[PDB]
Design a protein around this motif. Structure first.
Motif, short mmCIF file in Angstrom:
data_model
loop_
_atom_site.label_atom_id
_atom_site.label_comp_id
_atom_site.label_asym_id
_atom_site.label_seq_id
_atom_site.Cartn_x
_atom_site.Cartn_y
_atom_site.Cartn_z
N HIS C 57 1.00 -1.13 0.10
CA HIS C 57 0.19 -0.11 -0.12
C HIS C 57 0.88 1.25 -0.21
O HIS C 57 1.91 1.26 0.54
CB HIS C 57 -0.92 0.04 1.19
N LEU C 58 0.57 2.28 -0.65
CA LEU C 58 0.85 3.69 -0.75
C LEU C 58 0.33 4.61 0.05
O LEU C 58 -0.73 4.80 0.07
CB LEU C 58 1.16 4.05 -2.21
N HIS C 59 1.20 5.35 0.73
CA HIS C 59 0.47 6.27 1.71
C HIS C 59 -0.10 7.64 0.97
O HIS C 59 -1.13 8.12 1.28
CB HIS C 59 1.77 6.99 2.63
N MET C 60 0.75 8.01 -0.11
CA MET C 60 0.11 9.29 -0.79
C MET C 60 -0.89 9.02 -1.70
O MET C 60 -0.89 7.80 -2.59
CB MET C 60 1.50 9.86 -1.62
N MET C 61 -1.78 9.74 -1.60
CA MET C 61 -2.96 9.49 -2.03
C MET C 61 -3.46 10.61 -3.28
O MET C 61 -3.22 12.03 -2.84
CB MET C 61 -4.29 9.32 -1.38
N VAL C 62 -3.88 10.48 -4.34
CA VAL C 62 -4.07 11.43 -5.37
C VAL C 62 -5.58 12.20 -5.21
O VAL C 62 -5.47 13.27 -4.73
CB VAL C 62 -4.10 10.81 -6.75
N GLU C 140 -13.15 12.18 1.68
CA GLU C 140 -13.73 10.91 0.84
C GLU C 140 -12.67 10.10 0.37
O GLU C 140 -11.42 10.75 0.37
CB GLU C 140 -14.77 11.31 0.21
N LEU C 141 -13.06 9.07 -0.21
CA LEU C 141 -11.97 8.11 -0.95
C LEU C 141 -12.94 7.63 -1.93
O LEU C 141 -13.78 7.01 -2.00
CB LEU C 141 -11.56 7.15 0.02
N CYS C 142 -11.99 7.85 -3.17
CA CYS C 142 -12.35 7.26 -4.45
C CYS C 142 -11.22 6.59 -5.25
O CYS C 142 -10.26 7.63 -5.54
CB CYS C 142 -13.15 8.30 -5.16
N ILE C 143 -11.49 5.38 -5.62
CA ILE C 143 -10.35 4.75 -6.65
C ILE C 143 -11.15 4.94 -8.02
O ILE C 143 -12.17 4.85 -8.13
CB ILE C 143 -10.60 3.16 -6.21
N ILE C 144 -10.35 5.38 -8.93
CA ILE C 144 -10.56 5.67 -10.28
C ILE C 144 -9.79 5.03 -11.40
O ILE C 144 -8.27 5.01 -11.03
CB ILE C 144 -10.81 7.21 -10.34
N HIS C 145 -10.10 4.75 -12.39
CA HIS C 145 -9.45 4.08 -13.47
C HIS C 145 -8.85 5.22 -14.20
O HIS C 145 -9.28 6.27 -14.73
CB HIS C 145 -10.13 3.27 -14.32
N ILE C 146 -7.45 4.98 -14.83
CA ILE C 146 -6.78 6.17 -15.50
C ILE C 146 -7.57 6.57 -16.69
O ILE C 146 -7.71 7.51 -17.19
CB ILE C 146 -5.44 5.55 -15.98
N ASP C 147 -8.35 5.63 -17.40
CA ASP C 147 -9.11 5.95 -18.68
C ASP C 147 -10.33 6.95 -17.99
O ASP C 147 -10.69 7.54 -19.02
CB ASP C 147 -9.47 4.59 -18.99
N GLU C 148 -10.77 6.51 -17.07
CA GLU C 148 -11.97 7.49 -16.35
C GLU C 148 -11.33 8.99 -16.08
O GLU C 148 -11.94 9.96 -16.49
CB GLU C 148 -12.74 7.05 -15.43
N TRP C 160 -10.70 18.25 -9.17
CA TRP C 160 -10.31 18.13 -7.52
C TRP C 160 -10.21 19.84 -7.13
O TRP C 160 -9.48 20.20 -6.42
CB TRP C 160 -9.06 17.74 -7.35
N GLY C 161 -11.13 20.64 -7.65
CA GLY C 161 -11.10 22.11 -7.20
C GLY C 161 -10.53 22.87 -8.33
O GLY C 161 -10.75 24.21 -8.35
N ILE C 162 -9.72 22.44 -9.03
CA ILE C 162 -9.16 23.60 -10.09
C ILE C 162 -9.85 23.60 -11.37
O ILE C 162 -9.83 22.47 -11.95
CB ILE C 162 -7.69 23.09 -10.24
N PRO C 163 -9.99 24.54 -12.00
CA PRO C 163 -10.80 24.69 -13.35
C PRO C 163 -9.67 24.52 -14.26
O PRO C 163 -8.48 24.56 -14.08
CB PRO C 163 -11.41 25.94 -13.31
N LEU C 164 -10.13 24.01 -15.27
CA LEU C 164 -9.40 23.84 -16.60
C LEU C 164 -9.91 24.55 -17.90
O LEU C 164 -11.21 24.78 -17.88
CB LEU C 164 -9.24 22.39 -16.82
N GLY C 165 -9.15 25.03 -18.91
CA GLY C 165 -9.62 25.42 -20.14
C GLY C 165 -9.56 24.42 -21.14
O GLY C 165 -9.16 23.15 -20.97
N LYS C 166 -10.34 24.73 -22.33
CA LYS C 166 -10.33 23.90 -23.32
C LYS C 166 -9.17 23.95 -24.63
O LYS C 166 -8.95 25.24 -24.94
CB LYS C 166 -11.97 24.02 -23.99
#
Lengths: 82, 100, 167, 252, 64, 135
Positions: C57-62, C140-148, C160-166
């Motif tokens: 197991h890894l301590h650092m969570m994305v 919270e805790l959510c495991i997600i696939h790289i494709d998603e 995760w709170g930071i907006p993005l441009g197109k």
RNA sequence: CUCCUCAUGGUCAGACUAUGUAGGGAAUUUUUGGAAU
């Protein structure tokens, strides 16, 4: 091996002075120093106990015959402080 | 000397330095100078800090870094001609596998 | 002068990529003050900045990911170095583990359209989205696939709170 | 709670054997009857706790006067982690190596509680079944009710249905305990005498109580055993964590 | 042999408790992804078809 | 005092000096008294206490502490390792001791010191001389 | 107490370091004197 042997090996390539059991002083560049204190020396200026001074090209004196050496102060830094 | 280099090796890597809290919640019976015998130990300037944000914030401050450098050298201030990520990054994979 | 706000990256400033609130949450967070910036990295250093994240197991969570990403921004290394760090070291599998989405969201924040190289970086990140990888993430805790996370990330506005441009 | 009040309360436990009585069941030769000495019981009470359940195994053999009489010679104290009203216990001990064991049969086990019951509870029955499932069906249990001023020896048996119940129902299972009832239990015949005496077996590490050693205890795991004197439930050997915390209170 | 076994099981007990103590100190698929991007891409084409249908309704409004 | 606590407020430390000088005395006396009385529960615990006054440590602190040459890191590691003392004593191979104490360094030293720690293979055969007397 | 040898446990690519019921520190470069007058 001896720690002073290790220093004396670091002294190779420098200008050192040597006093032998006879009392003659040989100043020059130290070529080589064996573990047994046998030293090979270059361009030596020699001062006898009578005061007479001579010049010689290559000299090699036995370890056992050396009273003491004086080595340059550069080495005093390290690593023998530990 | 060598022990001072080990002290260096300590105050450099923070992951081990981060934890002085191993006591967690515990009761300890007994002007910031020469240590309070408690709190967080900064040996470079000889000050101990009762809170974490002061201990790390002081470390992020210039004066603590100036003293840390005046101890020995100036690595803290020390391009990228691709050898940095090639050799250094390859050393990250290699050392990572060595630890794993 | 608010924070450092230096340099380059789209003609205004580097730190403008991230909101003031979250940015000051990071710069006021513990992890940033301890393991990062000038005293930890000996000035700005990208490879030692990678020593921090790779060291984490890894301590650092994305928190730590937000911070390390933010310092990636503020340092702004070379796109070439991004290329190498992305495509090198195939002899070890634990190296790029959490570095994937880090170098990914990084270039996702960088620029929107060197251009062709950036596009190759994106399509390569699409290939890795097809690489079928699994990872865990926390706030919270959510495991997600790289494709998603890659496709949902490029198609999605906020991450995760930071907006993005197109692009 | 914790160590202080119960450990200080442990000193008074020798007072609980001044008065000893049981509800006297009809004596019947049809089933085997047990003869328990007054010293072993006393020592077990001393080692035990006022709240937490302490439980050991008990061994012996049939004397040649009556084969139906079972004399309890050897108590065997085993690795365990106790709670209030429940306990975790290791496997059946392998004691063949020690001397003074010439075919010592497995008679049963003994335990402490504070509630007065005519039956065995869920935490007890399940543990019993887990110990003796396929190994010995007719082994018995000694449930010692303990309260300040007197103790009471409540012996019990078990039928074949209880073993099945314990096999199926291990963790929690309060409703199936309620349904299970005290019916399966049958009051076994036990006696207390000063005319014989017995001895203890203890683990090689000489720490039987793993209360505060949570990592070291293993519910199925091998242990060496030896004869000796067992320690107090709260005793210096059983409370090592406290010394590092005690010196850690001042620190350094 | 028995004594050696006792010393051994003892060593394994010590080592296991040692690893456990270290732990205490520390404490102190692919088809679903392809089909998922297929349904997601179908949602993208459905959204573009919804925008195109909206532009169609606007064209009908301009014609009317 | 058994746990080695020096103090800041020195009133307590003065009292504990008094206890330092007279403690092993009093405890040792109590032990001898119980030994004369022939009481089993107190005599063993009192003997442990006397030992603790003499050598200044607990049972749960490992006996390697009373060696002058045994280092500090090792004794900390054993205190924290939660292992029965008999196992360490039974260990023979020095490399295997270093592995058991999980530091490779100093293992040989530790094993040397173990063979310097008292270890007894003890046996007793009782036998009656007559009915009353037992040799 | 010190240096070497040996043994050893560890680490590094033979060297270094702790420990030792170990051997040793009189035949050419050091500690069993070529010094004495």
């Amino acid at each position: 091996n001896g720690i002073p042997v290790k220093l004396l090996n670091e002294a190779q390539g420098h200008i050192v002075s040597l006093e032998l059991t006879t009392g003659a002083t040989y100043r020059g560049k130290l070529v080589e120093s064996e573990d047994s204190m046998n030293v090979q020396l270059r361009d030596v200026i020699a001062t006898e106990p009578q005061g007479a001074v001579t010049h010689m090209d290559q000299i090699f004196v036995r370890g056992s015959q050396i009273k003491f050496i004086v080595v340059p102060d550069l080495l005093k830094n390290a690593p023998l402080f530990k | 000397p060598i022990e001072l280099q080990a002290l260096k090796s300590k105050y450099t890597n923070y992951d081990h330095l981060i934890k002085g809290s191993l006591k967690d919640l515990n009761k300890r019976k007994l002007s910031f100078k020469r240590g309070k015998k408690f709190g967080f130990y900064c040996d470079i300037c000889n000050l101990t800090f009762k809170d974490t944000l002061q201990y790390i914030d002081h470390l992020n401050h210039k004066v603590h870094a100036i003293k840390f450098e005046n101890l020995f050298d100036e690595p803290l201030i020390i391009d990228v001609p691709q050898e940095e990520f090639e050799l250094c990054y390859h050393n990250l994979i290699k050392d990572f596998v060595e630890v794993r | 002068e608010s924070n450092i706000s230096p340099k380059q990256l789209n003609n205004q400033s580097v730190s403008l990529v991230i909101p003031r609130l979250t940015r000051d949450k990071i710069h006021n967070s513990m992890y940033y003050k301890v393991n990062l910036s000038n005293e930890s990295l000996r000035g700005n250093t990208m490879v030692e900045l990678l020593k921090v994240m790779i060291g984490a197991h890894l301590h650092m969570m994305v928190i730590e990911f937000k911070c390390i990403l933010m310092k990636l921004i503020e340092i702004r290394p070379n796109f070439q170095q991004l290329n190498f760090l992305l495509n090198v070291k195939n002899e070890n599998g634990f190296d790029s583990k959490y570095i994937i989405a880090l170098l990914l969201v990084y270039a996702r924040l960088q620029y929107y359209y060197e251009n062709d190289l950036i596009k190759l970086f994106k399509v390569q990140l699409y290939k890795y989205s097809q690489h079928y990888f699994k990872l865990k993430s926390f706030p919270e805790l959510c495991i997600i696939h790289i494709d998603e996370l890659v496709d949902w990330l490029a198609t999605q506005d906020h991450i995760w709170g930071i907006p993005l441009g197109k692009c | 709670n914790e160590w202080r009040k119960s450990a200080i309360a442990n000193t008074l436990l020798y007072l609980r054997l001044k008065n000893i009585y049981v509800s006297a069941d009809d004596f019947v030769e049809e089933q085997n009857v047990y003869v328990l000495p007054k010293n072993l019981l006393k020592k077990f009470i001393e080692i035990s706790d006022v709240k937490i359940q302490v439980a050991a195994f008990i061994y012996g053999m049939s004397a040649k006067d009556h084969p139906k009489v079972k004399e309890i010679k050897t108590v065997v104290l085993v690795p365990q982690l106790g709670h209030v009203g429940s306990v975790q216990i290791s496997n059946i001990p392998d004691i063949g190596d020690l001397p003074d064991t010439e075919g010592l049969e497995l008679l049963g086990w003994i335990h402490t509680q504070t509630e007065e019951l005519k039956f065995m509870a869920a935490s007890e029955v399940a543990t019993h079944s887990k110990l003796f499932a396929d190994k010995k069906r007719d082994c018995i249990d000694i449930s010692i009710f303990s309260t300040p001023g007197s103790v009471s020896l409540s012996a019990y048996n078990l039928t074949d249905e209880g073993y099945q119940w314990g096999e199926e129902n291990k963790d929690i299972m309060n409703v199936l305990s309620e349904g299970f009832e005290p019916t399966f239990s049958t009051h076994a015949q036990l006696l207390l005498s000063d005319r014989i005496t017995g001895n203890f077996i203890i683990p090689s590490g000489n720490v039987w109580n793993y209360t505060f050693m949570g990592t070291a205890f293993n519910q199925e795991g091998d242990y060496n055993f030896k004869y000796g004197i067992p320690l107090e439930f709260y005793n210096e050997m059983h409370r090592p964590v406290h010394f590092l915390q005690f010196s850690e209170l001042a620190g350094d | 042999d028995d004594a050696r076994v006792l010393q051994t099981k003892k060593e394994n007990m010590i080592k296991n408790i040692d690893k456990a103590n270290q732990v205490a100190k520390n404490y102190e698929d692919s088809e679903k992804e392809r089909q998922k991007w297929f349904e997601r891409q179908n949602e993208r084409k459905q959204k573009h078809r919804r925008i195109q249908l909206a532009k169609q309704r606007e064209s009908e409004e301009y014609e009317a | 005092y058994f746990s080695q606590l020096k103090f800041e407020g020195f009133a307590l430390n003065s009292d504990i000096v008094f206890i330092h000088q007279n403690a092993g005395r009093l405890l040792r006396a109590m032990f001898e008294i119980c030994l004369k009385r022939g009481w089993g529960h107190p005599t063993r615990m009192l003997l442990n206490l006397c030992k603790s006054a003499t050598t200044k440590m607990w049972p749960t602190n490992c006996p390697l502490r009373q060696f002058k040459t045994c280092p500090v890191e090792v004794i900390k590691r054993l205190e924290a390792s939660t292992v029965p003392w008999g196992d360490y004593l039974q260990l023979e191979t020095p490399a295997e001791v270093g592995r058991a104490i999980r530091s490779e360094k100093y293992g040989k030293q530790v094993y040397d010191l173990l063979k310097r720690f008292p270890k007894m293979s003890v046996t007793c055969n009782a036998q009656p001389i007559t009915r009353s007397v037992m040799r």
